[PDB]
Design a protein around this ligand. Sequence first.
Ligand SMILES: Brc1ccc(Oc2c(Br)cc(Br)cc2Br)c(Br)c1
Ligand SMILES: Brc1ccc(Oc2c(Br)cc(Br)cc2Br)c(Br)c1
Length: 1182
Amino acid sequence: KPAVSVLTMFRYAGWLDRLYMLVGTLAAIIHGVALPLMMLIFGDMTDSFASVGQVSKQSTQMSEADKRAMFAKLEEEMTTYAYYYTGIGAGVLIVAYIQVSFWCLAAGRQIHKIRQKFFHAIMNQEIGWFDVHDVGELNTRLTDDVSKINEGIGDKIGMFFQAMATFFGGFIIGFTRGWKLTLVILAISPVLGLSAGIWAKILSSFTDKELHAYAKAGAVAEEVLAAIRTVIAFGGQKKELERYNNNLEEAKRLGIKKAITANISMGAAFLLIYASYALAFWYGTSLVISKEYSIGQVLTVFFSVLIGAFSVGQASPNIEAFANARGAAYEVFKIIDNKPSIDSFSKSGHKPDNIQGNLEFKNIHFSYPSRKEVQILKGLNLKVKSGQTVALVGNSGCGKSTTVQLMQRLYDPLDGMVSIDGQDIRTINVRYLREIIGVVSQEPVLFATTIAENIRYGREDVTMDEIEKAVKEANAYDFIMKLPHQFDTLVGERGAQLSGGQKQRIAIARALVRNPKILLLDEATSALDTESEAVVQAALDKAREGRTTIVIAHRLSTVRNADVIAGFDGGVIVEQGNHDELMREKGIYFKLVMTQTPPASFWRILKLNSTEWPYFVVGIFCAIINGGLQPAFSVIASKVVGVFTNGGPPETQRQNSNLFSLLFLILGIISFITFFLQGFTFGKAGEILTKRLRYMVFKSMLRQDVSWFDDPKNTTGALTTRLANDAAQVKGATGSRLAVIFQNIANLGTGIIISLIYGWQLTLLLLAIVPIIAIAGVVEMKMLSGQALKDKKELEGSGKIATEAIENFRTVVSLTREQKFETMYAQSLQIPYRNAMKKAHVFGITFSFTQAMMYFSYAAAFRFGAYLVTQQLMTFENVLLVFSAIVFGAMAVGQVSSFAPDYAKATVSASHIIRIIEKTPEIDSYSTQGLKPNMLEGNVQFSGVVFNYPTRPSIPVLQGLSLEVKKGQTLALVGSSGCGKSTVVQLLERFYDPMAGSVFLDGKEIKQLNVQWLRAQLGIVSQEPILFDCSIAENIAYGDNSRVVSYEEIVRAAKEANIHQFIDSLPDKYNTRVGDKGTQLSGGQKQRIAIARALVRQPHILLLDEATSALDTESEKVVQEALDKAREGRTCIVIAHRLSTIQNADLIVVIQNGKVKEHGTHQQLLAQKGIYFSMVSVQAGA
Ligand SMILES: Brc1ccc(Oc2c(Br)cc(Br)cc2Br)c(Br)c1
Ligand SMILES: Brc1ccc(Oc2c(Br)cc(Br)cc2Br)c(Br)c1
C-alpha cells in the first residue's frame, strides 16, 4: 500500500543513466512500432498477388502473355517488399539490443549504488533504532527488496514502452487504414472479457468446494489416524475404511460434476472467442464485396488491431514490476533518508587530548525503547575518580549494565548528563568517544577472520609486534601459540570453536590495542568456568591500573580490590564506599555477600488405471479428432483469403465466402462437441482412480502395525498430506496434460501433412527455420538461468558479511570499525557490478538475436514463397496455409514443455504411493491365519520378556520381565516410572512382538495366535479416551464389531459404566453426537463411555492404563467406582497411579529396570519394606 515518488526512486540516476533510459526507451518504442508496420507491408504484398490473382484468372485466352506483365509486377513488387522486410529485421536487431542493454546498464549501475547506500544507512542507525526492529527481517529486506527494485528499473521498462508502441502503432494503422473494422473488433471485446470473467467466478468458487469435499473425507482420516491405536485395538479397521470409502464415493460424484461443468465452460468460452473473431473477419469480407476495402487492407487492420489489443496484456506484467519496485523502495529509502541524532559517522564535536578520565553521572533518568512501560533508572548520582576502579553491584534489574550502555553513548539519557572529564559526553565526537573507551562484554564475539584480524578490529593500523604484546599482556599469548597456524587461525560460528575464557582473552586483547583511557567491564567474568576465570581475571587486573574503570559483575571476588563499590536499589544509588565501609553499613551489599557465601518408468500406476479400458480411447480418439480439426480452421481461413485472392471473376466470390464462414461455424460446434468429450472422459477417468488410489492406500495404511505409526517420519498430519497430494498429482498426469499432449501432436501431425503435400520445398524450408528459432529461444533461457544462479551465488557472499556485520552490530559499533564493514561490503559488491555490466550486453545480444531470427525467418518465408516458387506454378493460397498450419502446430507443441513438471511432480508422488501400498508389516491384522481357541477362561503369562521400542532402541524398557495372572483376579502393576508399566498392556494387545522371550494367555503363545481374535478378548481403556464423532451409542457399540450391537446391549454397558445419568439427561439421549463437533463434555463422561465400549465386548481381560490420570475431585471417585465394578469378574491388569485404589488387589507387582522387583498382595508388600512400601508412603503423606 505505501509507495514512492517516481523521481525519488531514480534519484541515483544521473548523466549517463538518464541518457541510457532515454535511448533505451527510444529504441524500445522503435522496437514495438516495427511489428505493425511488418503487418502493413503484408497488406501491400497481398494486393500485389491479388491484382495478378484477378487478372490471371480473368484471361482464359492468352497464356504466354501472362508470363510477362504479371511476372514483371511480381518481380519489382516482391523485391521491394523483401527489401523492406530485410530492413525491418536489421532494425529490430539494433533496437532490441539498445532496448535491453541500456536499461540493464542503468539498472545495474543504480542497484550497485542502492546496495552501498543502504548498507551504509544500516550501520548509521543508533542502537535505540535496532532495539525496536528485527535484524533478520532487515537483512532479508536488504537482499530481497533491492532485488525487487532491480526487477522494476531493468529492461522491463523497455519492454513496457515497446508494448505501448505496438499498442499505439497498432491502433493507429488500424484507424487510418479503416475506422470501421476497429470499432467492430472493439465491440466483441466485452464478450471475450466476459467469458474469461466466468472463469474467475467458476474457478474460485469450485476450487473451494473440492477443498471442502475432501475436507470431509480428510476429517475422517484425521480422527482415524490420530486414534489409530484405538481402532486397531477394537478392530474397526474395516469400518473406518468403509467410512472413508463412503466419503470418497461422494467426492468422486462432486468431482465428475465439476468435470462436466468445467469442460462445458471451457468449450463454450472457446466457441464464443473464435466466433467473435470469425464474425469480425466475415464482417471484413462484407466490406470487400462492397469495394470499400482491399483484401489486403482487411488483413492490415485486422492484424495491427489484434496485435495492439493483445499488446495491452503483454504490458500489464511490466506495470506490476515497476509498481512493486516502487513500494519496495519505500522502506529502503526510508532507511537511507533517515538521519540519526547520534550518528557515529559524523565528523563533529570535540576530540580532547590528555584525557585524564574523571567520569561522573548527574541525575540520569533513562528508559530503554520499551519506553513508558518501564523506567529502569529513577534518578542517579555516581562519580568515579581518575585511575580508580569503581564496581557496581545490584540485586536485579541490571541497572548496573545500563551505565556502561550510556557511557558509550549508545543511548542518550531522558534527563541528566554523563560527563567524561568535565565536558558533557554529547559535545565530544561519537567515534572518538568510542575510541577512548574499551569494552569487554559478558558474551564475547569474534568475527570470521584470523586472530590478528580480530585483534586488528581494535585498530586498523597495527603490526604483529603490537598484536604480540597485546595478547601477551592479556596472557593470551601462551595458549594461541600452541594452536596451529599461529596468529593465522580461524574463528567464528563456523570453524575452530574455542573455550569461553579464551575468546574473552582475545576480546580483552582486542580492546587492549584500542589503548583506551576509559574501560568498561560488564560481567566479563560472569558465565564462565571457574578455572579459566582466574586466568582471565589476571588479565583484567593487568588491563586496568593504567585506566579508569567501571566494572559490573555478580562475582564478588573481583570487587574487593576496587577503590569504590556502588549498590543499586530500584535504579536509585543507595550505598557507596570501600568494601569495609559497606559491611559496616550492613545494607544491600552486605546482604548479597551473605546470600552468595526416484523418477523411473512406473507403468503399473497406469496398469491400475487400466481398470477403465474405455473412457480413455473415447478421449484419445476424440482428442486426435480435435487435433486434426484445428488446422482445418487455418485451412478454411487460408481459402477464405485464398479464393478471395485467387478470385478472378468477382460474381462467384460473394456466394463462396458465405459457404466458408458457415463451414467454419460448423467446424467450431464440432470442435466444441469433441472438446467436452475429451475433457469429461479424462475427468471422470481421473476421479474414479482417485477413489481407487485413496482407498487402497488408506486400506494398506490401516494394515501396518503400531511400529510404523510411531515413526517420527509418519505423523497424522504428514499421513493425511501424503494421502491427498499423491492421489491428486497422479490424476493430473493422466488427466488434461495427456489429452492435450495427444491433441497437439495430432494438431501438428494433421497440419504438417497438409502443408508438406501442398508446397514442395516450401515446407522443407520452414522445417529448417522453425526448429532453429525454437532452439535459439531455448538456449537463451538456459543462459538466462545460468547468469541468474551465478549472480545469486556472488551477492550471497556479500550479504554473508552483511549478515555478520548487522547480527553482531552492537559489538562492532562499540569497536567503531563500521567503515571497515562498509569497505568489506563494497569490495564484495564490485564483482556483481562488473558482472551486471556484462549482463546487459549478453541480455541485449540474445534478445536481439531471437527477434532478428524471427524477422529474417519471415523474409526467407516470402522471398522463397515468391520468386522461385511463384515464378513456378505453385500458388500463394498454399503459402498462407503452410504458414498458419506450421506455426500454429508449433505453438501447440509449446504446451508440451509447460506440462512437463506436472509429469515429474506426479511420478515422484506416484513413487511414494506405489511403495506405501506394497509395504507389508510384521504384525498384519488382515491375515486370517491364527488359531482362534474355543476355551473361554483367560490367563496371562509373561516370561523372560526383553523389549526395546523400535523407534528408540537405546534405553531398554523391559529386560527379562515375567508375570502370571490367573482368571478373575486383578494384577496390579506398580513401576518407578516409564512405560515399563504400560508396555505390558501393549504387548498383550500384541502391538509388538517382544525381542526375546514370549507372552502367553491360555498357555498358547500370542505370537502364533490370531492377532485380531487376540485383541477381541481385551477390554482396553487408556488415559485419554478418544471418541470419534458419532452417536455415543456408536462409540459404545464400537467395542464389538463384526456384529451390530443391540440398543439394550449398549444400554447395559452404559448402565454398567454409570454414565446413564448423562445419557438420559441429554435431549437426544443415546443419539447425541460427541467429538467436539456436535457436543462437548468433560473427561469423566468420556472415560465412562470408553468403559462401556470396553465391556460391550464382554471381554475376558480388562486393561486399565492409568485410567484416572487426567481427573479430579468427585470425578475420580465415581470413575474409580465404575472401574472397581468392572473388574472382579474378569482377568484384569491395572497400572493406575492411585496406590490407594490398588490396596484391594489380588497381586501387586513392582517393576524395576524391566525386571520384576517386588510382588505379592498389598499387606505382603507392606510387610516387606522397600520399593512398594516407599511408593505407598510417599504419596499417602503427600
Ligand atoms: Br491467412 C489467415 C490466417 C489466420 C487467420 O485468423 C486466425 C488466426 Br490470426 C489464428 C488462428 Br489459431 C486461427 C485463425 Br482462422 C486469418 Br482471418 C487469416
Ligand atoms: Br515477423 C512475423 C510476422 C508474422 C507472424 O505470424 C503470421 C504468420 Br506465420 C502468417 C500470417 Br498470414 C500472419 C502472421 Br501475423 C510471425 Br509468427 C512473425
